[PDB]
Design a binder for this molecule. Structure first.
Ligand SMILES: CCCCCCCC/C=C\CCCCCCCC(N)=O
Lengths: 122, 122
């Protein structure tokens, strides 16, 4: 769900990383507006989209099957919206590692007026 | 959207308040499994359930219209799902205020093991 995405995060992020994703960019953690200030914060957008597209079932509450073969991410059964959900997180969690180098603390807990600009479509 | 939402919490339940729903209980913050704990937790959950009902929109990424009628959150003349999403965020919000003292600091942060159970139904 999100409890997982978290562990799914920590997993490929060395435990206590989700904390750095509590409130980032215009999309990360609490957010949803203007344009993605950062690629990492863009990782977020996706995940939001990814979920946003998901047909019918609830993610915040969706409980799925996922594993970590050799410290690496792997989603279980390839059937159901769950296939989908477990995907975002995977990717997401991953997209993270993909840009952990471009992380701007100065982008932590920003303010609305930071993203007040026009939205940006998925 | 979270932001919109965020504000609400800062609004009705003072500032910095948000930071206290960042994570707490099986359903507040990052979570989504097992049964709730007390009240506050329930407050969230439903929201999630509320978010759960909705369709054709993304509560994370939606952007409704709200405002405090000088003292209490109020979702103004709507046009669709926003109508809802707002309301969702709206009450869930009021919902917290409805049970402040009941807050239990030690319920903020569970190992996702404190909930290790099956998410109930909406
Ligand atoms: C690729 C990055 C992923 C996008 C960012 C995901 C961050 C998750 C945000 C949601 C959890 C924050 C707490 C709000 C949830 C409280 C739920 C309740 N019903 O209000």
């Amino acid at each position: 769900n999100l409890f997982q995405f978290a562990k799914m995060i920590n997993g490929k992020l060395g435990a206590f990383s989700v904390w750095n994703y509590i409130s980032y960019g215009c999309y990360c953690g609490w957010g949803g507006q203007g344009t993605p200030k950062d690629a990492t914060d863009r990782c977020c957008f996706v995940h939001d989209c990814c979920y946003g597209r998901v047909r019918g079932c609830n993610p915040k509450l969706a409980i799925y099957s996922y594993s970590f073969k050799k410290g690496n991410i792997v989603c279980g059964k390839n059937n159901g919206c769950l296939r989908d959900i477990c995907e975002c997180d995977r990717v997401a969690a991953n997209c993270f590692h993909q840009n952990k180098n471009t992380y701007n603390k100065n982008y932590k807990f920003l303010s609305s007026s930071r993203c007040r600009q026009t939205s940006e479509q998925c």
